[PDB]
RNA sequence: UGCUGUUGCUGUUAAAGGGUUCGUAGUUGAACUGUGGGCU
RNA sequence: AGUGUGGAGAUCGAAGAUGAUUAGAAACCAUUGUAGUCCACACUGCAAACGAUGACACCCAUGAAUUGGGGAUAUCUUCACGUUUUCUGUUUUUUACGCGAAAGCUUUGAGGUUACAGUCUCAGGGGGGAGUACG
């Protein structure tokens, strides 16, 4: 049984908030993982761990261990989230990392290679990330390329639910912990970029927890 | 301080060390030619 | 010293265009200058402009709405025949559903779209998007 | 690792080429006169239990005629104003803490 | 900044390129006949011979073994 | 602002507020001027202190009031407050106008840290100083919330969306100024519509 | 009207992000420092109607510190704000 | 293997800006002669 | 620093001498002292010769200063100085975008670069052998 602690957690059990795009549209923080579990079906939400690795500290007696893992999730239908976290116990880094992920879930705008028949399957245009000095390019594909890609920036973009792209690394690749960052980058910005179709201007509509205030002071 | 660790000997000195080894051997050329 | 007035002007529209200026002033002007910003201006890129004449290589200022994401010269002006197409919009270009190359031709100044319909090479000048 | 934006002195890259050198105060080592630790005093002759007793055995110094002073202007090296605590290492956050008059 | 780029200048980036090359071990070892005199098969990849002894060849450390090697 | 679809000069200068501006000395900077504050200085005056245009001071007074009194729920919005002199002036001020309030030193975390009591999610915040609050108006920036400012001419405008440009600093000018917004609010509100002066007294804002 | 159509005629994109009407670029999902301001229409008489305006703003704005004076622009344009005396 | 780099590398501290100027081949080089007009 | 030929030779001082210290001390410390250190003419062409950052050109946020010239309009002395506000050129400092592996840089870029093209030029390609051998 969950209780939310905030204004936001409270609109979701009410069922006053039916999706995620309406927290996306107004860029409002997820403080509870609750949320995301809720709005997004059952069938609908895979996960799986990525890297897990150990680190260590010098102490005055031999140094001490601790164990940081790395969480993916994703819909396979445009969302997706990663989360790190470390532990003193590799069972607690794993359970911590999966709340993590459910924290920092992004929408993934997909587009078209050449003619616009049937559904989205590829990046609508070029688009890099970069973390340390890890950079991550992607490239629009035609239909039926696949995703041609390193095994970990593979199985990311798979989550997302690209279908076809091409892919170049750069920098020291093997650091995984920033080349799992770098491709999670590159998605984020697909949905940051002005394209002549959405050149149209639009009015502003009222933010929920505005529109719902009486609501929530009870 | 105020240097980075070096491969042997001060480099100053080695330095000097090969620079009186090519004056010999240029005496010894001149001697048999 | 200066060498190209064309590269020079693009440079300096891309710049205010990244601070998201709403004016930005262009100095020298040139005829090649101008026939560039009519292209940009044709599919509503940039908004209206003005010449200013000094007696000398005049000035210009354009107004910019926020539509504008970068231009830019090539240099040197490489030679385009018409199978060159896919190659330079493969190269330089974010997509293959928006964004243009802007050619001289022996027909004038025009996009990349519009030459290939006329059947014409040329000269590779710049690019926006 | 660069450890000071000056690099120690007071030289800017394009103000100068060559600073001539002075002697230290105490060792005598050569440091050109910019970088080196400079100090104006001035020093009293004599202490407080001194000066009493020399003021009363005098027709001329007195209440109203004070004693004279030593002045001087004394250059270090960096070594020697490290060793006679004129100067101190300081923690990285305050060592651009800077004074333009005597306090 | 680091490039010539007129569009006249191809004698000056063909030289450049050319001079360059020489830097590069793998590609100097292929066009330089030091390294084929040296090599005792000729550039072959086997040769025959005749055993002249047996000897054994201590390992570095830290292994510590006796190799039986032979001298053809 | 002043300005409304109707096209009224109803809110407006009546040359009574005017004077109770000038009585509390409410206009006068502090010999500094930042890039942001400049364009709300008319002059200089002697000792070089810098005076505040008194028509764009009271514009963006009603500005702020008009938002203010947009929300429904007064317990929504907080005002806060470092200066020890403002602390008397937005007791008052709550009481009246019904929001909450929290003056002294602001608590790190307040805003963004869930787990702890005492968690607040204001939707507008209202701060006496910029560079004093600045604690509280760094926290806002991490959670969208629109803040609202009493800023003097060297003031830092980083995270301020709505300035309101006064005397910030000395006892007379604080109760002033809040006294007034309170006013504002309320005949915008419904109630005190009448013509007759306020009865509230503004003694009761000032520091004791 | 906004948004990526495939042939089929359908609207393919899963939404449409806030436009600002200031910079003019796109509001991210991840900003957390844009802000929603809205403010009361007072009717003839001095008291309000029930109706708001609602103005974005986009995050970057508030950190160079010039959200302020884009504020002043975008009122004046609406007619909420005068000018001069 | 974007570790020979035209597309497409690096040069403050990792390898690497010549001690400073003058200067011939070479490479590069500012603007301008130009809005056709009238009819349904 | 070193070399050649003339001068000069106070101070300091490679080599060397004599006292100490030390297990030893050829060194650091003390007393000295040759060549030098200075000048003229002729060579040599090397430096952490450093901003460890090639030259020319464009754009670029803010606050206090400073050196030289000029424009506009309350202070002192008897033409100079100094006040306030602009301006061109110079050496800098404090607290923005952006960049970088980081330290850090930032109108004086190491910014405006995988959204990779203003012009010319010098150098590098794992560590040693070695800036050595031969010419
Ligand atoms: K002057
Ligand atoms: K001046
Ligand atoms: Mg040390
Ligand atoms: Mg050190
Ligand atoms: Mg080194
Ligand atoms: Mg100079
Ligand atoms: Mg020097
Ligand atoms: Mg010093
Ligand atoms: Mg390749
Ligand atoms: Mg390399
Ligand atoms: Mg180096
Ligand atoms: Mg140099
Ligand atoms: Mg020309
Ligand atoms: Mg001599
Ligand atoms: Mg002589
Ligand atoms: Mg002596
Ligand atoms: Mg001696
Ligand atoms: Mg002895
Ligand atoms: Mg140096
Ligand atoms: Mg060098
Ligand atoms: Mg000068
Ligand atoms: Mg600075
Ligand atoms: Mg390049
Ligand atoms: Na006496
Ligand atoms: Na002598
Ligand atoms: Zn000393």
Redesign the pocket.
């Known amino acids: 049984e969950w209780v939310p602690c905030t204004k936001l957690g409270r609109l979701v059990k009410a069922q006053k908030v039916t999706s995620l795009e309406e927290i996306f549209l107004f860029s409002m923080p997820i403080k509870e993982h609750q949320i995301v579990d809720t709005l997004i079906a059952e069938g609908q939400l895979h996960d799986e761990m990525m890297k897990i690795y150990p680190v260590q500290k010098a102490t005055s007696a031999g140094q001490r261990t601790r164990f940081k893992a790395f969480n993916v999730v994703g819909d396979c239908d445009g969302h997706i989230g990663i989360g790190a976290r470390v532990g003193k116990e590799v069972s607690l880094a794993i359970r911590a990392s999966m709340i993590a992920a459910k924290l920092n879930i992004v929408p993934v705008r997909r587009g078209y290679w050449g003619n616009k028949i049937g559904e989205p399957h590829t990046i609508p245009m070029?688009?890099?990330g970069?973390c340390?000095?890890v950079?991550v390019?992607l490239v629009p594909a035609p239909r039926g390329t696949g995703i041609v890609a390193a095994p970990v920036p593979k199985k990311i973009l798979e989550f997302a639910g690209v279908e076809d792209v091409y892919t170049?690394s750069?920098?020291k690749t093997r650091t995984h912990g920033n080349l799992i960052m770098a491709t999670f980058y590159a998605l984020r910005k697909t949905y940051?970029?002005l394209t002549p179709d959405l050149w149209a201007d639009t009015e502003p509509s009222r933010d929920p927890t505005d529109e719902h205030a009486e609501l929530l002071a009870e | 301080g105020?240097?980075?660790r070096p491969?042997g000997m001060r480099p100053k000195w080695?330095?000097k060390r090969?620079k009186r080894?090519?004056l010999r051997?240029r005496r010894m050329?001149q001697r048999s030619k | 010293?200066?060498?190209?007035?064309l590269?020079?002007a693009l440079?300096?529209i891309?710049?205010?265009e990244?601070?998201g200026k709403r004016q930005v002033l262009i100095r020298?002007?040139?005829?090649?200058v101008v026939k560039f910003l009519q292209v940009m201006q044709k599919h509503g890129y940039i908004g209206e402009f003005e010449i200013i004449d000094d007696h000398?290589?005049?000035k210009i200022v354009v107004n910019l709405n926020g539509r504008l994401?970068?231009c830019?010269?090539?240099?040197?002006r490489?030679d385009c025949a018409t199978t060159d197409y896919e190659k330079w919009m493969k190269?330089?270009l974010?997509s293959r559903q928006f964004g243009f190359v802007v050619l001289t031709t022996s027909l004038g100044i025009m996009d990349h779209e519009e030459a290939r319909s006329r059947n014409t090479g040329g000269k590779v000048l710049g690019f926006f998007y | 690792?660069?450890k000071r934006?000056?690099?120690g002195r007071s030289?800017?890259?394009?103000?100068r080429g060559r600073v001539k050198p002075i002697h230290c105060f105490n060792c005598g080592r050569l440091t050109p006169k910019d970088k080196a630790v400079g100090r104006f005093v001035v020093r009293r002759m004599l202490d407080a239990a001194s000066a009493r007793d020399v003021a009363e055995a005098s027709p001329v110094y007195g209440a109203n005629f004070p004693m004279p002073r030593l002045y001087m202007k004394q250059r270090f090296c960096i070594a020697c104003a490290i060793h006679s605590r004129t100067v101190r290492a300081r923690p990285?956050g305050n060592r651009?803490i800077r004074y333009t008059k005597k306090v | 900044?680091?490039?010539?780029?007129?569009?006249?200048?191809a004698?000056?980036?063909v030289r450049?390129?050319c001079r360059?090359?020489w830097?590069?071990?793998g590609?100097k070892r292929a066009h330089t006949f030091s390294a084929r005199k040296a090599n005792p098969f000729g550039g072959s990849s086997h040769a025959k011979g005749i055993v002249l002894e047996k000897i054994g060849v201590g390992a570095k450390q830290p292994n510590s073994a006796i190799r039986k090697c032979v001298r053809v | 602002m002043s300005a409304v679809e109707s096209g009224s000069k109803v809110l407006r200068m009546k040359e009574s507020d005017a004077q109770k501006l000038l009585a509390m000395r409410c206009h006068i900077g502090t010999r500094?001027?930042?890039?942001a504050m400049?364009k709300y200085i008319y002059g200089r005056t002697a000792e070089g202190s810098h005076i505040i245009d008194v028509h764009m001071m009271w514009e963006k007074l009603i500005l702020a009031a008009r938002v203010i009194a947009a929300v429904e729920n007064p317990k929504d919005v907080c005002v806060c407050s470092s200066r020890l002199y403002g602390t008397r002036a937005i007791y008052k001020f709550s009481q009246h106008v019904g929001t909450s309030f929290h003056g002294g030193r602001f608590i790190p975390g307040t805003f963004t840290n869930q787990i702890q009591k005492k968690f607040v999610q204001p939707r507008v915040l209202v701060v006496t100083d910029p560079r004093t609050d600045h604690q509280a108006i760094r926290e806002a920036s991490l959670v969208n919330i629109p803040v609202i400012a009493l800023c003097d001419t060297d003031a830092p405008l980083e995270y301020v969306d709505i300035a309101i440009p006064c005397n910030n600093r000395g006892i007379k000018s604080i109760g002033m100024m809040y006294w007034l917004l309170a006013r504002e609010v309320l005949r915008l509100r419904g109630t005190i519509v009448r013509s007759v002066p306020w009865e509230e007294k503004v003694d009761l804002f000032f520091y004791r | 009207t906004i948004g990526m159509f495939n042939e089929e005629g359908e609207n393919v994109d899963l939404y449409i992000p806030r436009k600002c009407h200031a910079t003019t670029t796109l509001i991210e999902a991840h900003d957390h420092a844009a802000v929603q301001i809205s403010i009361a229409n007072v009717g003839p008489n001095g008291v309000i109607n029930g109706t708001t305006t609602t103005l974005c703003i986009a995050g970057?704005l508030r950190?160079?510190g010039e959200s302020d004076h884009a504020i002043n622009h975008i009122t004046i344009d609406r007619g909420i704000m005068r000018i001069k005396t």
Do not use: E
């Not at chain 5, 900044?1 to 200048?9: D, E, P, R, S, V």
């Open positions: 070029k688009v890099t970069k340390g000095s950079a390019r170049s750069r920098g940051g970029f | 105020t240097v980075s491969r080695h330095k090969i080894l090519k051997r050329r | 010293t200066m060498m190209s007035v590269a020079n440079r300096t891309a710049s205010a990244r601070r020298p002007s040139s005829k090649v000398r290589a005049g994401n970068k830019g010269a090539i240099c040197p490489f190269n330089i974010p | 690792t660069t934006r000056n690099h030289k800017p890259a394009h103000s990285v651009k | 900044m680091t490039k010539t780029n007129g569009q006249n200048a004698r000056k980036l450049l390129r360059n090359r830097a590069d071990k590609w | 500094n001027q930042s890039s400049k | 970057y950190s160079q």
